[PDB]
Amino acid sequence: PQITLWKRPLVTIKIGGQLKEALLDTGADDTVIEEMSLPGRWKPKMIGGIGGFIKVRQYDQIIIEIAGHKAIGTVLVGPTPVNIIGRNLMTQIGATLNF
Amino acid sequence: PQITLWKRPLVTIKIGGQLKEALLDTGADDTVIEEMSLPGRWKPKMIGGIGGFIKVRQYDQIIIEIAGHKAIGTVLVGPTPVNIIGRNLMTQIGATLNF
Ligand SMILES: CC(C)CN(C[C@@H](O)[C@H](Cc1ccccc1)NC(=O)O[C@H]1CO[C@H]2OCC[C@H]21)S(=O)(=O)c1ccc(N)cc1
Ligand SMILES: [Cl-]
Ligand SMILES: [Cl-]
Ligand code: NA
């Protein structure tokens, strides 16, 4: 699609067998999801934004379906106030900003 | 232009006669820039990101060039780690997300 920015660019994702809503966020380097279980190994990470840092679990090689488009990559899991799809996965679905 | 997301989508802005770099950020409702002087009165605002909230100064009807496009609108000033152009001004320059 072409998604205008009058409202938050929310999309449906599928991750870990679960359907969720997430924000397409060009200002996020990494994808960060609210607490949930994911399979395999993880390692701890700190990520920072406005407000400061939160501690997250970094899971690699996670498949996510984003608006119907499959992508694989790193997913960070932790106490984010919103599920955010970052550039690491947006590149994989061919997302661009146009003006 | 068409901006891919392999790198941070940084653009040049001009505000108060000064060039700055800023991030086109679809996950930001609001434009928030690092401390600087702007004309007129400001109003209080709290914004919440990853990390928690911060207090900012809200300036309305500020003239700002973004990647060579004129916008006039609300600019928040506060301790953001990076200058961020949010949806409020990205809509003024006609930006969309496409995939
Ligand atoms: C501040 C940016 C440089 C970085 N952020 C992404 C940004 O899009 C967040 C993403 C976001 C969105 C909602 C809540 C928390 C974080 N937006 C944000 O803080 O926007 C604030 C300004 O406008 C407001 O509208 C949204 C909250 C306000 S971040 O959420 O801190 C972040 C940092 C690292 C990663 N990997 C992923 C996300
Ligand atoms: Cl990745
Ligand atoms: Cl590409
Ligand atoms: Na893994």
Alpha-carbon distance A30 to nearest alpha carbon in chain B (angstroms): 11
Residues of chain B found within 8 Å of residue A27, distances taken between Cβ atoms: 23-28, 84
Alpha-carbon distance B18 to nearest alpha carbon in chain A (angstroms): 22
Q: How many angstroms separate the Cα of B24 from the Cα of each of A14, A22, A71, B88?
A: 26, 18, 22, 11
Among candidates A23, A27, A91 on the partner chain, residue whose Cβ is nearest the Cβ of B23 = A27
Name the structure determination technique: X-ray
Among chain B residues, the shortest Cα distance to A46 is held by B51
Given an 8 Å threshold on Cβ–Cβ distance, is A87 in contact with B6?
Answer: yes
> What is the C-alpha to C-alpha distance for residues B68 and B91, in angstroms, rounded to an integer?
14
Residue type, B64: I
> What is the C-alpha to C-alpha distance for residues A13 and A10, in angstroms, rounded to an integer?
9
Q: Say if CB B44 and CB B33 are below 8 A apart.
A: no
Q: Element (H or E) spanning B59, and its range?
A: strand B52-66
Nearest to A93 by CA among A18, A17, A22, A16: A22
Q: How far is the CA of A12 from the centre of ligand 1 (A)?
A: 18
Q: Which residues of B38-67 are buried (b: 16+ CB within 10 A; e: fewer)?
A: eeeeeeebebebbbeebebbbbeebebebb
Q: Which atom of ligand 1 is nearest to the CA of A80?
A: 15
Q: Say if CB B19 and CB B13 are below 8 A apart.
A: yes
Q: Which CATH superfamily is domain B1-99 in?
A: Acid Proteases (2.40.70.10)
Q: Which residues lie below 8 Å from residue A88, measured CB to CB, with a gap of 6+?
A: A29, A30, A31, A73, A74
Compute the radius of gyration of chain B from its Cα atoms: 13
Compute the radius of gyration of chain A from its Cα atoms: 13
Strand order in the sheet with A2-3: A2-3, B96-98, A96-98, B2-3
Q: Say if CB B86 and CB B32 are below 8 A apart.
A: yes
> What is the C-alpha to C-alpha distance for residues B55 and B32, in angstroms, rounded to an integer?
11
Q: Say if CB A28 and CB B27 are below 8 A apart.
A: yes
Q: Which residues lie below 8 Å from residue B80, measured CB to CB, with a gap of 6+?
A: A50, B32, B33, B34, B54, B56
